Design a protein around this ligand. Structure first.
Ligand SMILES: Nc1ncnc2c1ncn2[C@@H]1O[C@H](COP(=O)(O)OP(=O)(O)OP(=O)(O)O)[C@@H](O)[C@H]1O
Ligand SMILES: [Mg+2]
Ligand SMILES: [Zn+2]
Lengths: 226, 48, 235
RNA sequence: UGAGUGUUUGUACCACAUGUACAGGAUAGGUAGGAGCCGAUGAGACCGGAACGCUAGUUUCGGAGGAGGCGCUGGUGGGA
């Protein structure tokens, strides 16, 4: 029913006790027995209910340490913005014509950023991207006047966070390879952006439960005060 | 049935005038072009 | 849903006089009254189409699925598929969103803030009304009332009264509502079709207000009955 | 003005089970991570029981036996 490794990690974890953030990062590094560079992801169960148009939140947050996995960058740009993409060193720079080839080609690029003007040409393709979630969004900022900032943020490891329907928003803070101290710093940045992201119409405690888990490791409640 | 009524200015929502109308003879809200002292010009006043 | 001191008088003939009502959530309310009692008018108040002369009518923020007593055919040439598709705001937002993209090219640094916000809401709203519905609707007809696909390409005005009621009823369900306001949902339906509607409404977990002159149909569904009095102008 | 029993109920954890529309390999709940994962602490395949079941199958229990499968990959789909 449960692997011996998971069972040992479960005994390590305290269901009753919500760890501090530092204890949680250390404990996750302990729990991920499987010998692969598993990521560490945290879930916040917000009080807000997405179905209300105001309540639903969608944003993108940069991490000073990064995700621990590099990210490919796709850019839709024209003229000076293409020049800026080249300066930024984006993996791919494309035009309205190359979007068709991008459909079915150069796939697996982590994220897309399109210039405002391009969005009109991009949107036709974006209908395909919509279900994929690749299409850029102004609120996340992936639509920008300058592509350089988006490229460097993507390189820096910017993570897009979108509240799930159930109301638990999950985000990877970093790789187990990153030191527990770096992982907790990523978590602190995530917590701050969420607090600022709390909508006005929201009421009551913002977060019902915060749980940290490695890819293999089980969920660990983390004290909100910590 | 004749009843007292108030004519409110559409432009400023001011209840400038009092009058009366027969409901049966004038089922719909009465509308008149009357001078609005606040705006100092003729405006459409509708019963409320 | 709550109404206090409700008053409404069209000309000389009055509908509500100091009427009041409180409906709890998750109540399959059966609205009953003689013709002209003001049952349809109540929904118009809930839908904010009408305004009470005096009093307060309180409605929850949840999305409402409204089934009009009369079919709304904006144009004679509208096809059944066009009529049903209009239930969801997918098409309307895309037309607005497409214009937003046009403005983005025209405007460089003036309206971008407003356009970007409008684009963001439309995308988030569009994803909220998941654009996969194009396939779901096609199969909602099959599972709902065995509505043949040949009708799907036919002008709606040419359908039969019973057929129109199925389309209108399906459109309400297609909208994926939170509160159901059904105004005579079985006006033209035959015996077989009525069976499906009854079973679905029995299972429907949410609140559903039903205006019906079919006592047996209501008895199988209704748990609370609201009577609109024609002489006392009360509820 | 305090002890109990039982019954009917409301709330809250905690366990359990359940997710079959079209296509889809077929019983696809959503999100995130995921290349790797699970099994002599008894895997695969086989057999009986029981449950669910939209009748297509799914879940679970046990008999023997003993070491295997699953994933990624691939195509489908809005979604693997
Ligand atoms: N704009 C209006 N002007 C004048 N009278 C009106 C107006 N609207 C409604 N009325 C009157 O309101 C009265 C009741 O309203 P309503 O149409 O909702 O009755 P109803 O119970 O829904 O009818 P039925 O049950 O037969 O479908 C009608 O008799 C109608 O004559
Ligand atoms: Mg009516
Ligand atoms: Zn005036």
């Amino acid at each position: 029913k449960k692997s011996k490794k998971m069972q040992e990690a479960l005994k390590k974890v305290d269901a009753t006790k919500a760890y501090s953030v530092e204890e949680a990062v250390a404990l996750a590094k302990d729990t991920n027995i499987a010998k692969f560079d598993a990521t560490v992801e945290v879930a916040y169960k917000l009080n807000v209910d997405p179905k209300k148009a105001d309540q639903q939140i969608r944003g993108a947050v940069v991490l000073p340490n990064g995700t621990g996995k590099t990210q490919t960058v796709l850019v839709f740009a024209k003229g000076e913005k293409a020049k800026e993409a080249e300066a930024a060193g984006a993996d791919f720079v494309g035009d309205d014509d190359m979007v068709a080839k991008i459909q079915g080609g150069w796939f697996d690029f982590d994220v897309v950023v399109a210039t405002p003007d391009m969005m009109a040409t991009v949107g036709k393709l974006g209908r395909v991207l919509g279900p994929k979630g690749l299409m850029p969004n102004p609120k996340t900022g992936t639509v920008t006047m300058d592509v350089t900032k988006a490229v460097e943020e993507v390189k820096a490891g910017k993570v897009t966070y979108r509240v799930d329907k159930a109301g638990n928003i999950h985000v990877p803070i970093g790789k187990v390879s990153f030191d527990n101290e770096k992982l907790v710093e990523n978590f602190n940045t995530i917590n701050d952006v969420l607090l600022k992201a709390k909508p006005s119409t929201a009421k009551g405690q913002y977060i019902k439960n915060i749980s940290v888990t490695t890819t293999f490791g089980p969920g660990i409640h983390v004290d909100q005060a910590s | 049935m004749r009843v007292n009524i108030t004519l409110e200015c559409t432009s400023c929502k001011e209840r400038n005038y009092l009058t009366n109308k027969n409901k049966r003879n004038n089922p719909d809200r009465l509308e008149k072009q009357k001078y609005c002292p606040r705006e100092r010009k003729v405006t459409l006043h509708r019963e409320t | 849903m709550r109404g206090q001191k409700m008053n409404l008088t069209f000309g000389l003939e009055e509908v509500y006089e100091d009427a009041e009502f409180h409906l709890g959530d998750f109540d399959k309310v059966g609205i009953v009254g003689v013709n002209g009692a003001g049952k349809t008018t109540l929904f118009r108040l809930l839908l904010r189409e009408l305004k009470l002369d005096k009093g307060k009518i309180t409605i929850g923020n949840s999305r409402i699925g409204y089934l009009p007593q009369e079919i709304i055919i904006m144009d004679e040439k509208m096809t059944v598929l066009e009529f049903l598709a209009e239930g969801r705001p997918i098409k309307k937002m895309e037309t607005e969103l497409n214009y937003i993209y046009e403005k983005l090219t025209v405007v460089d640094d003036d309206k971008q803030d407003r356009l970007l916000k409008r684009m963001g809401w439309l995308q988030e709203q569009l994803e909220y009304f998941d654009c996969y519905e194009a396939e779901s609707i096609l199969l909602d007809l099959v599972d709902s009332m065995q509505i043949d696909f040949d009708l799907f390409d036919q002008p709606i005005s040419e359908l039969s009264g019973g057929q129109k009621s199925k389309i209108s009823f399906a459109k309400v369900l297609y909208s994926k509502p939170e509160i159901l306001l059904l105004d005579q949902p079985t006006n033209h339906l035959d015996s077989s079709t009525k069976e499906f509607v009854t079973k679905y409404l029995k299972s429907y977990r949410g609140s559903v207000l039903i205006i019906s002159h079919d006592i047996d149909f209501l008895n199988q569904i209704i748990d609370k009955i609201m009577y609109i009095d024609k002489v006392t102008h009360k509820i």
